[PDB]
């Protein structure tokens, strides 16, 4: 699958690489870093967005001039997706939602949209590299509804395109993550950090820039990445206890944990489950007490001992104790 890059510069902002990528869902957390690293090599990036035109505003700074071209679309409409995908030799999918909005359910936002994107790439022959980003714990048996939809999207995208790589990272840590920041907000608003599983579940947090660099390296491969499923995980296997202690180290606050068993947190997060319907479709999004996320913290999520990792791409993840978590000084 060689022919998707042709360096025409010094590898700087004004340099030219032969990559024209359409990054769906680039207005979120990972997209802000993926688009930045794509634009650094001189690759043109198309950023399709929905809703307000202020969402992709911060991405225009990343390219030189015309490198980043935001375009409106509608996932429901099929002609818009084809329009925003025509001039593209690479397609990267980042579309996903951890909570449920009545307009777009767990299956719609995580499986149907990815399936439609894979199809539209199939008829629009010419995308040399396709990347779909699922979650590390994605499995059909997973109790969490989001993970099951991501897994189903995985088989869907493999069936629709055998050449599509599946980057499958773990919980991300960064300036705008949804795990460390809600914890610190809860601490600064209520004084204590609840532990939904008692700080016992083990998982492998990964710094977001490492995931973006992994995707970039997979794009700039020797062809071995095509049709593979990487599992991107951090170096140290932390737990909800150790990460909270590290946060208190960064926030500089006296630790104060309130242990909560699984059933009580499950029942306290239940109200938002049967109150999805109401006079308004919008509803305050969950911050730490998502029922799906609590269910996701019932089975330990570790990178498989027999699956591809960072070291198979010639990358070394950052240690999530120094520079990766330095953003927490703003609450200090």
């Amino acid at each position: 699958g060689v022919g998707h890059l042709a360096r025409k510069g010094t590898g700087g902002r004004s340099s030219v690489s032969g990559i024209v990528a359409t990054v769906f869902g680039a207005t979120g957390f990972l997209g802000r870093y993926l688009v930045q690293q794509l634009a650094k090599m001189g690759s043109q990036v198309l950023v399709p967005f929905r809703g307000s035109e202020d969402s992709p505003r911060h991405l225009k700074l990343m390219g030189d001039l015309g490198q980043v071209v935001p375009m409106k679309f509608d996932p429901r409409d099929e002609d818009s997706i084809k329009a925003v995908m025509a001039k593209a030799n690479v397609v990267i999918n980042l579309i996903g939602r951890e909570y449920e909005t009545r307009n777009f359910s767990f299956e719609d936002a995580n499986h149907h949209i990815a399936e439609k994107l894979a199809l539209v790439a199939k008829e629009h022959g010419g995308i040399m590299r396709y990347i779909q980003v699922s979650c590390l714990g994605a499995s059909v048996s997973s109790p969490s509804r989001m993970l099951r939809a991501k897994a189903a999207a995985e088989e869907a995208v493999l069936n629709a395109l055998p050449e599509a790589t599946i980057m499958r990272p773990a919980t991300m840590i960064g300036t705008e993550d949804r795990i460390l920041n809600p914890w610190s907000m809860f601490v600064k608003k209520y004084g204590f950090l609840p532990l939904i599983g008692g700080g016992t579940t083990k998982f492998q947090p990964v710094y977001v820039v490492d995931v973006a660099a992994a995707i970039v390296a997979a794009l700039k491969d020797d062809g071995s990445s095509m049709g593979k499923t990487y599992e991107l995980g951090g170096p140290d296997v932390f737990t909800t206890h150790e990460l909270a202690e590290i946060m208190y180290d960064m926030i500089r606050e006296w630790p104060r944990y309130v242990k909560l068993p699984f059933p009580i947190a499950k029942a306290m997060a239940a109200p938002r489950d049967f109150m999805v319907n109401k006079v308004p479709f919008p509803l305050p999004s969950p911050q730490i007490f998502n029922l799906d996320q609590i269910n996701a913290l019932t089975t330990d999520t570790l990178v498989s001992d027999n699956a591809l990792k960072f070291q198979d791409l010639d990358l070394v993840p950052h240690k999530l104790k120094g520079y990766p978590v330095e953003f927490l000084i703003q609450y200090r």
């Binding site: 025409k8 510069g9 010094t10 700087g12 004004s14 340099s15 030219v16 043109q44 001039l65 015309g66």
Partner: protein, 51 residues
């Protein structure tokens, strides 16, 4: 690596006014084309210093 040389008289003019001066040629050839307007881009600070 630079080249020290004295530029010679052009073949299209018979005047000899721009002679006797010595220049340092930095051999700055790394240039490309801007893929938005066709302008000549560069990443070499010594692109035209010696000229």
């Amino acid at each position: 690596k630079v080249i020290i040389y004295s530029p010679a008289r052009t073949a299209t003019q018979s005047g000899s006014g721009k002679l006797g001066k010595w220049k340092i040629n930095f051999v700055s050839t790394l240039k490309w084309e801007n893929p938005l307007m066709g302008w000549t881009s560069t990443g070499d600070p010594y692109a035209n210093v010696g000229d």
